[PDB]
Design a protein around this ligand. Structure first.
Ligand SMILES: [Ca+2]
Ligand SMILES: [Ca+2]
Lengths: 319, 309
């Protein structure tokens, strides 16, 4: 009789609206409570991603015109194709992937953070448009859209992830949501960093660094939430989900290698791009609480390219 | 023989990812094209809502403490309850309502704009948290959350709209989405408008005005897209959809009147709040391309409150 409550906590006898909408219409709904935070990590991530708000209009991409004009039509086509491919992946994640995470949230604040992620990946997709508007002809832009629609190897990658977003397994959906910012775009990000290391398109690489400042947090956060949810499963179910993660990454690496060999055909950059990709595949696995199986030889990045990748985003570009 | 295409444009033989994901897996996916924009209104709305980015940290709510301390416990409770009620609506809009619109978009840019809306109405909900952190006791905050969960009249309003978001009729979902910032907002916003006019809580009022600046664009945009899409129905199905809008608004006015009576009756503000609500219900219908059926008498607003619209 010593521990009887005079009133029962509202939180434990109500559900978030998204729970009510998709899972259980038997309880009443609670408003989000930002005054009593369940997980302090949510507040840290919310504060970082909102403080990091930026728009591509902030970057003087016009200052890349001299170095753009030092690249032949084949290079300009490769860049337009690569970036239109990255635009497709960001369109997938903004319109499907990140918003699909909201209903599977462990906390109230996580629901709002994934809304931020979906919006900011939309800004990432929009930023390629800003670059194209400054550097590319109408013909180059149209050709790259045609090439992306008609590239089966390119299309195979988002087609492999989308079913996990639309299905009812929240852990498989979460793994897909981590794999996109954690892995799938790095083969393309290699190209601007390779070029900027050789003195070309420095302002473009500034936009890539603003995109990556967001992507690394998206990857970290989805991996963090995956680890909390998978830890509640039986040992057998945890082993099954680990096998699924490695099986899906295995498939996605195969599809990425096939695509990058086609994309970089005639440039000989596929092997360098793939090593850069696998370095990031290792960090993706580490963010899900697993060990990287990749050899030093397989993940070797030129220091000049690593310097572009690791350079901190220019705060002058912050909103 | 004169009109054959040598190659069909990529746009008309591909689909956006969200179309591929939910509706048709038979075509390949196109990347969003921000260089060739189908509707210039999308670019205008995108530029306005992104340029209007704000966070509640950048308002000095602490400067309201003297004004807040001029309000008795009953007034402080009413404000905390009203704002926690608006927090619930914003939580519904952020987590379900706005994101449900993405897959039903007419244009590529509309998909990204509704992602912005979902995020920014999340910022609206967060901004009430900022106000409470500065002004309210932990007891006042917890009481208001308890009140929201146990208020059946309050709960009835989002419970009536959520089924449209999760169902497969995109125009009914669009209407249910617009009713949140376009109608249910105003019963609650009456209170800060009333208090501001009497000289209370000027810094809190700055947050309310930043929220309003976003919500008026949200309502315009959903209304704009509704009118474009309902224009592509048969005359018979256009008539059916008009009847649906009036039927659902009639239901939502019934639920709102019951809630505002329970929220305000002890303060004698319910009749003023309901007239304010009905005025904005008239504007909601005009925003969908319909006529207001409401009388001058039942939509009467005090000039100093009317001025803040
Ligand atoms: Ca090579
Ligand atoms: Ca009265």
């Amino acid at each position: 009789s010593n521990i009887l409550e005079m009133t029962k906590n509202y939180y434990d006898r109500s559900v978030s609206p998204v729970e009510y909408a998709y899972f259980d219409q038997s309880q009443n709904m609670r408003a989000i409570n930002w005054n009593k935070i369940v997980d302090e990590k949510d507040l840290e991530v919310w504060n970082r991603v909102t403080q990091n708000f930026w728009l591509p209009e902030n970057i003087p991409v016009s200052n890349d015109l001299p170095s753009w004009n030092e690249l032949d039509d084949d290079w300009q086509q490769l860049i337009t194709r690569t970036f239109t491919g990255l635009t497709l992946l960001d369109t997938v994640q903004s319109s499907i992937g990140d918003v699909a995470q909201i209903k599977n949230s462990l906390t109230e604040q996580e629901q709002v953070i994934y809304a931020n992620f979906a919006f900011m990946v939309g800004v990432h997709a929009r930023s390629y448009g800003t670059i194209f508007s400054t550097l590319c002809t109408s013909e180059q832009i149209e050709e790259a859209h045609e090439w992306v629609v008609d590239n089966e190897a390119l299309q195979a990658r988002p087609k492999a992830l989308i079913p996990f977003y639309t299905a009812d397994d929240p852990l498989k959906s979460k793994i897909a949501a981590a794999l996109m910012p954690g892995f799938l775009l790095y083969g393309g990000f290699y190209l601007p960093f390779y070029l900027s290391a050789r003195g070309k398109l420095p302002n473009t690489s500034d936009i890539i660094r603003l995109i990556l400042r967001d992507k690394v947090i998206h990857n970290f956060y989805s991996g963090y939430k995956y680890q909390l949810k998978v830890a509640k499963l039986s040992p057998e179910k945890q082993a099954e989900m680990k096998q699924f993660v490695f099986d899906l990454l295995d498939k996605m690496i195969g599809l990425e290698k096939t695509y990058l060999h086609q994309l970089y055909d005639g440039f000989g950059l596929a092997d360098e791009a793939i090593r850069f990709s696998l370095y990031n595949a290792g960090k993706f696995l580490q963010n899900l609480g697993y060990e990287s199986p990749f050899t030093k030889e397989e993940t070797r990045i030129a220091p000049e390219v690593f310097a572009q990748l690791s350079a901190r985003a220019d705060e002058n570009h912050d909103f």
